[PDB]
Amino acid sequence: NAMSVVILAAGKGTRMYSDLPKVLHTLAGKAMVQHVIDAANELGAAHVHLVYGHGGDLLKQALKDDNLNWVLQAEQLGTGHAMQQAAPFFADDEDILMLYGDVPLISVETLQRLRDAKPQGGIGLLTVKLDDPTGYGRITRENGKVTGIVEHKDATDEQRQIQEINTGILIANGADMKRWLAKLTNNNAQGEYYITDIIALAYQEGREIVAVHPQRLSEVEGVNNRLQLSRLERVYQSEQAEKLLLAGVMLRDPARFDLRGTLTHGRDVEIDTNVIIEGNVTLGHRVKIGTGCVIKNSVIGDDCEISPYTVVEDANLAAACTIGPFARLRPGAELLEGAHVGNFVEMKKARLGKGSKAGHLTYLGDAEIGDNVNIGAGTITCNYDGANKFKTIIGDDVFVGSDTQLVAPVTVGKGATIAAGTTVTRNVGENALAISRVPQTQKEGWRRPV
Amino acid sequence: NAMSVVILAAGKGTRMYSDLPKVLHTLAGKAMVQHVIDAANELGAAHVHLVYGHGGDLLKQALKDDNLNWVLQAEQLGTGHAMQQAAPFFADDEDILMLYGDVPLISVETLQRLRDAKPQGGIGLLTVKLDDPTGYGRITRENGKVTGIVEHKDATDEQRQIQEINTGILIANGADMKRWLAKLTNNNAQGEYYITDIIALAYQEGREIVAVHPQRLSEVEGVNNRLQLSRLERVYQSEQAEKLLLAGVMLRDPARFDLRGTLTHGRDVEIDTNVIIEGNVTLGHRVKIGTGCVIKNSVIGDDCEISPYTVVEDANLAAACTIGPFARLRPGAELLEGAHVGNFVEMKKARLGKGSKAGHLTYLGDAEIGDNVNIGAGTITCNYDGANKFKTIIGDDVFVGSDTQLVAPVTVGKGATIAAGTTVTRNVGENALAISRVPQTQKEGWRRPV
Amino acid sequence: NAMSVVILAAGKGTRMYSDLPKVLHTLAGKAMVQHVIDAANELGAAHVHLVYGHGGDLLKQALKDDNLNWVLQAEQLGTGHAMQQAAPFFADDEDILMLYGDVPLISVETLQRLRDAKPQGGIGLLTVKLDDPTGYGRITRENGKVTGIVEHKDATDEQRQIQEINTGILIANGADMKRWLAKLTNNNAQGEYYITDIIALAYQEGREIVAVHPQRLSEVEGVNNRLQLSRLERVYQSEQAEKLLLAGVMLRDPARFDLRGTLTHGRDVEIDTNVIIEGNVTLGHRVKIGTGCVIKNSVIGDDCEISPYTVVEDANLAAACTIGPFARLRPGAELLEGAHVGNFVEMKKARLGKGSKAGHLTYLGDAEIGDNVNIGAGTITCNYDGANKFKTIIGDDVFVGSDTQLVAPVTVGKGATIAAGTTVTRNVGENALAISRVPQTQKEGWRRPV
Ligand SMILES: CC(C)(COP(=O)(O)OP(=O)(O)OC[C@H]1O[C@@H](n2cnc3c(N)ncnc32)[C@H](O)[C@@H]1OP(=O)(O)O)[C@@H](O)C(=O)NCCC(=O)NCCS
Ligand SMILES: CC(C)(COP(=O)(O)OP(=O)(O)OC[C@H]1O[C@@H](n2cnc3c(N)ncnc32)[C@H](O)[C@@H]1OP(=O)(O)O)[C@@H](O)C(=O)NCCC(=O)NCCS
Ligand SMILES: CC(C)(COP(=O)(O)OP(=O)(O)OC[C@H]1O[C@@H](n2cnc3c(N)ncnc32)[C@H](O)[C@@H]1OP(=O)(O)O)[C@@H](O)C(=O)NCCC(=O)NCCS
Ligand SMILES: CC(=O)N[C@H]1[C@@H](OP(=O)(O)OP(=O)(O)OC[C@H]2O[C@@H](n3ccc(=O)[nH]c3=O)[C@H](O)[C@@H]2O)O[C@H](CO)[C@@H](O)[C@@H]1O
Ligand SMILES: CC(=O)N[C@H]1[C@@H](OP(=O)(O)OP(=O)(O)OC[C@H]2O[C@@H](n3ccc(=O)[nH]c3=O)[C@H](O)[C@@H]2O)O[C@H](CO)[C@@H](O)[C@@H]1O
Numbered sequence A, B, C: 001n002a003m004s005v006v007i008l009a010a011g012k013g014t015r016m017y018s019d020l021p022k023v024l025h026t027l028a029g030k031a032m033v034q035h036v037i038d039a040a041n042e043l044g045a046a047h048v049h050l051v052y053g054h055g056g057d058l059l060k061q062a063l064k065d066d067n068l069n070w071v072l073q074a075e076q077l078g079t080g081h082a083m084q085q086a087a088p089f090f091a092d093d094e095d096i097l098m099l100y101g102d103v104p105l106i107s108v109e110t111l112q113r114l115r116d117a118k119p120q121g122g123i124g125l126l127t128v129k130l131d132d133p134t135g136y137g138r139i140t141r142e143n144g145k146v147t148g149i150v151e152h153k154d155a156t157d158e159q160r161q162i163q164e165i166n167t168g169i170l171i172a173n174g175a176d177m178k179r180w181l182a183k184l185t186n187n188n189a190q191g192e193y194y195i196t197d198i199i200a201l202a203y204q205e206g207r208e209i210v211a212v213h214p215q216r217l218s219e220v221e222g223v224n225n226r227l228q229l230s231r232l233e234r235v236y237q238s239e240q241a242e243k244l245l246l247a248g249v250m251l252r253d254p255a256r257f258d259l260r261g262t263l264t265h266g267r268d269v270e271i272d273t274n275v276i277i278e279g280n281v282t283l284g285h286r287v288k289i290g291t292g293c294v295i296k297n298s299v300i301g302d303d304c305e306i307s308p309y310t311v312v313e314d315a316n317l318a319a320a321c322t323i324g325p326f327a328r329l330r331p332g333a334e335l336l337e338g339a340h341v342g343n344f345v346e347m348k349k350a351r352l353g354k355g356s357k358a359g360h361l362t363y364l365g366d367a368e369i370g371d372n373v374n375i376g377a378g379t380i381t382c383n384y385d386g387a388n389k390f391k392t393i394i395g396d397d398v399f400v401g402s403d404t405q406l407v408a409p410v411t412v413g414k415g416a417t418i419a420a421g422t423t424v425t426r427n428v429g430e431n432a433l434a435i436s437r438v439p440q441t442q443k444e445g446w447r448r449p450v
């Protein structure tokens, strides 16, 4: 059956105290409304209608899904009114599923169950039972059948005793939807147009409304302030962490792990406390990640060991590499098999070859370093002249003495040796020793200042 | 109505296993007793009487509140006895509020409610209902009115069934207080002087005792050991975190955030996991703080981005600065607008000008660096000669080559360039190139040691 | 009474998705089965029989306890069958206690209570009452006495109502054990040999079976997947943290503390958030450890302060040392009294003397540095020539200027001074100034590249 989704996101997020529209606030590194859009497409949505009232410029900048139909609702006259703005775009022969832009954890599995419960010519309604139903629409039933929804403000004390409430999510045929929407009136407690009135309108026509319930309450929780957002962030992180544990990834403390993107992994991966994974990350077999690491958009091969407090972004590590602790890999950093980066070392657009080592206090930027190379502590590639960037090339089997500065562009031939403290401004020949040293001298009986 | 506060803090903290008096142990970076003193002053206390038995030297070193009246209780003969030591200092026409020095979370709002419930000539009592009231004073009532308190040890099995217990906090007129205290006797189960006996003494006189309850149990929890302290630390951090979230500050994980002082902030501030804020910190609008940062007594302007694992103390950052990851700012560090500090960079009593950059492996101490300056990786200001410290001055538009040592005192004129690997011992002229380099030479067929 | 322990660990750990046998997966830095072995020896076990089915090579590599008797069970025909494989090794006059290799938190205190409850000629059984007993053996009783165990699969709906279940742990005389085991048959729902059938076999003989219960459920929880493992890891860390707090160690956040080995400590030690302790660590009095530190197999003297994000392994710090933040001490690092290591400093097989300082951007490897020495920022000991390592010796009262490279082997005499930017290749005399500097020159009107 064909189906499109409508996302109401035109309400004002006042308790957020933000200059950024509420639905753009992120959860696990992704806009709340993007989570909803993803669920809609993942369910099979042909078109996704997004109803907004303001922040349109920022929304269009953040959202780029091709099948997004932007629907304006200049005045927020109620959920019913918002749906009327989008209704003209509904197809007469497709189901229309309504979702909220600020209820990010809704699962496709529950939406699928809701789709299957919807009867021909009727309506699928998602309801939930709460201990305290205060503030939400009450589900009314006659002989076990759903007959309508009464909003909290409009409900009597007795009706307020009803604990089964409307989550807001529902699905119904597009043509039927348009028929009911045209009949909405605003003669109620809030003087708004209630999308909820279509339930009674359908029942009166003899149509059937069936209700299904979410798997978890967190699935239909809405966000109006940052505290509520932080709680859903934890729920999301906890569920993702448990899935990873069940899939064979060892997290030393699942409450101290954050995944903000996608994680691909092999077997026996171990991840210590406080690690953060961002963007798309691929980990090979037996990768070990020490505490506090941050890994973003990077590829890590089999058997790599990432020591504590190492930050990595857009890097590629071959098998058996060891980096950190306190290493900092920036975009373009590449390590070939068995390479090693130690503490207080930074790499940017730089490749380190097989079995090569940069153990300490070093900066490698815009460089190509061969295999079996040893980079002494304190070595620095001077890749910038104040306007342009230049490349440093170091061949295989090179030994670079400590505190050497390589002024790019420059090439050091294979097998060369560079003396400690050297400033390299010209190419170094193969198997040669490069040096630029003042012989050590001494002054006797030197007395330091008082 | 005039009011003074008395804080009993003379009990022995044996289960703390410490050489530091129990009430001096900190919670959120502040002494437990200081939290109580703050609540007393915040309530409007004219005088704060502090009753202590030992550790007086350390207490006087830690506490400096001007309105503190030190009251000695050499022998701990009971709360009643402690109050008798302070009683002579009570004014006949003021209310006297009694608090414990080891119950740090008591809220001014609850104390205010207690003050308002206190009847003329009577007593305001703070009581709470517990599932297991074992160990605490039982509140006795006659026709709904409080008539006394019976200590656990003195109470019969039936009275021990009473679940409403004494939190210990109470308030009453000073003159009345002195009248009852003089009548205390130690003929009871513990052979001590019970401050709790004044409740029955007042009731017998025809005075009225009214009870009020705390908003939260944590508010009246006392600390006798480190475990109990750690629990109140979490409660405190959790409540502060939720307030910040409700005020518009985004905390990526409120359970992994610690504030130990005061935090001032603009809008849309984002704070990642494991950040610690100490002393007084001011954050502008849109400040983003990455994971694990520690910020103490510092000012951070609008739009700054503090990358992961950066430590800052007594620093001042103008708008749009970017620092870290792995940057270390010490007292006196100042960055002007748009300045940048990268990884493994340390600054102390050093100013970096507008749009200036110190991207890596650098130490800047006792320096003034102008605008649009580029500090190459590995640069070091040698500000110390073994006894004295000297200043390094670098004008605008200066380019400092990598691994340059600036031996202070020295001045580098505007527009100058310093060659990589230079040792700068003398002033450099404007628009000039400073250099101290040995030309690179080479020895063919060099064979490294076997 | 003499007693040996048998540990069943031959079951397949399928839901672990690992190439490492399930019982070898670690909890608090120690193999799950090692925790069980430790409990067995700690209880007084004369011999520990370990029944395994595969991964024998890896198991033998990990476990080395001298009193381990390896027992093979090639086919997993049931717990009864596994016990028959070990039974021949049981002594007729010793008690035999059965434990599971994947139930790591079993406490010696509970096992001791179980040993004391075991009646002469009978059986001690460890049982627990669960809300949902689904999946476990049901304890059957006649007039209050345990008469047998019925496995879930074999139990009727009514018997499945029984909530008291078998934890699996039991103890009985070796000779009796062998008598019952020989009678096991596999005519039951799973077609396996149930060790649980010995309960009914003993009762029929007129022997008495007494049941005792664990102190905590976590004590008898078994691990089949990583999620269950992570939960027991938290339970373990939480209990260890609370013990440390009760013993006088201040943990700023007990939920953000991990101990993976042994921690020895003095009084008033303070440990901030996210610290990880590994191997055997000894802390003196008043040691303060800042956030995120990792300390492994090291000794820390009285009054040391370890600043944030410092990593330490196999190091020895005397009293009053201060290191970090961002310091990295590797094996062999030694600091004498009052020594100081600052940020972005690394030490390996290097000793720093009393009151000596290495404040920044430095690497000290294979060195002996005297007292009252000052190591300038950027100093590096070049201890490696590509095949051999050499020692650097620096006497007392030496001042090493910034960015100095010491090419080992070399000795700097007491009282010497080394100029900033020096490359030291030869010994430096006492009280002498060593230097290898090119005088600073200048080129006027230098224009940087466009
Ligand atoms: C250059 C270096 C390799 C020489 O070590 P070495 O051979 O044991 O030292 P030597 O005293 O024998 O000097 C070797 C040569 O350098 C020459 N030399 C010394 N000072 C010189 C200078 N200023 N210019 C040119 N040559 C110089 C000598 O004349 C000699 O030549 P020769 O062998 O033909 O006779 C060494 O000083 C060095 O810089 N090592 C690197 C250490 C390092 O940083 N390692 C990384 C691990 S932390
Ligand atoms: C000094 C430096 C700027 C010169 O680069 P360059 O102009 O392209 O190099 P050149 O080969 O043309 O040498 C330039 C001048 O230096 C002079 N020179 C070379 N060695 C010299 C020495 N020991 N003493 C004095 N002058 C020297 C040349 O004679 C020449 O003079 P000229 O232009 O009047 O003919 C460059 O080597 C340098 O140190 N760059 C800094 C890189 C850096 O650390 N960047 C930070 C980003 S990571
Ligand atoms: C070497 C150093 C100590 C000299 O400082 P200074 O005495 O104030 O400087 P001066 O101008 O007086 O030079 C002192 C001597 O060095 C000599 N000198 C200068 N350049 C020289 C060279 N290339 N070779 C040999 N001697 C040289 C001078 O001739 C002079 O000798 P004299 O005193 O007999 O007349 C200083 O430049 C230095 O390197 N300080 C270390 C700073 C540091 O890194 N501190 C750590 C804290 S961050
Ligand atoms: C009349 C109606 O629908 N009532 C339901 C609505 O309450 P209620 O209408 O009170 O809910 P909200 O005001 O929070 O709005 C719901 C969603 O609709 C959006 N929105 C709202 C009004 C508008 O004019 N434009 C718009 O886009 C909001 O941005 C939000 O995403 O949701 C509750 C669950 O949360 C249900 O129990 C109520 O039965
Ligand atoms: C007789 C009395 O008061 N009983 C109350 C007291 O119990 P109790 O007297 O047992 O309480 P504690 O011994 O903990 O002492 C209470 C407070 O008084 C201080 N202190 C105590 C004795 C002394 O001689 N000097 C002194 O300064 C302690 O340091 C602590 O701050 O508090 C309980 C709540 O915690 C109440 O339910 C009890 O009804």
Ligand SMILES: CC(=O)N[C@H]1[C@@H](OP(=O)(O)OP(=O)(O)OC[C@H]2O[C@@H](n3ccc(=O)[nH]c3=O)[C@H](O)[C@@H]2O)O[C@H](CO)[C@@H](O)[C@@H]1O
Pocket: C008, C009, C010, C011, C012, C051, C073, C075, C076, C077, C078, C079, C080, C081, C082, C100, C101, C102, C135, C136, C137, C138, C149, C151, C165, C166, C167, C168, C193, C194, C195, C196, C222
């Ligand atoms: C017949 C029997 O014993 N049933 C008990 C067993 O269930 P059950 O037999 O189902 O338990 P498991 O299959 O998990 O095995 C128990 C332990 O024995 C080991 N093992 C099992 C079979 C084998 O052939 N070899 C072997 O070494 C496993 O590795 C594990 O350490 O433990 C439950 C508690 O967890 C008890 O409530 C059940 O009454």
Ligand SMILES: N[C@H]1[C@@H](OP(=O)(O)O)O[C@H](CO)[C@@H](O)[C@@H]1O
Pocket: A357, A359, A374, A375, A376, A377, C348, C365, C383, C384
């Ligand atoms: N300084 C050298 C030393 O490191 P360290 O002595 O710190 O271990 O040996 C390493 C290989 O064993 C080399 O790559 C390093 O350049």
Ligand SMILES: N[C@H]1[C@@H](OP(=O)(O)O)O[C@H](CO)[C@@H](O)[C@@H]1O
Pocket: A348, A365, A383, A384, B357, B359, B374, B375, B376, B377
């Ligand atoms: N090394 C230079 C380079 O950094 P990097 O190449 O690491 O990005 O460019 C920066 C500005 O773009 C300069 O301030 C740095 O001195």
Ligand SMILES: N[C@H]1[C@@H](OP(=O)(O)O)O[C@H](CO)[C@@H](O)[C@@H]1O
Pocket: B348, B365, B383, B384, C357, C359, C374, C375, C376, C377
């Ligand atoms: N650079 C020096 C300075 O450090 P800093 O100025 O950063 O405090 O003084 C210290 C002692 O007071 C010395 O050990 C450092 O070598």
Ligand SMILES: [Co+2]
Pocket: A403, A421, B403, B421, C403, C421
């Ligand atoms: Co140098």
Ligand SMILES: [Mg+2]
Pocket: A378, A403, B378, B403, C378, C403
């Ligand atoms: Mg250097």
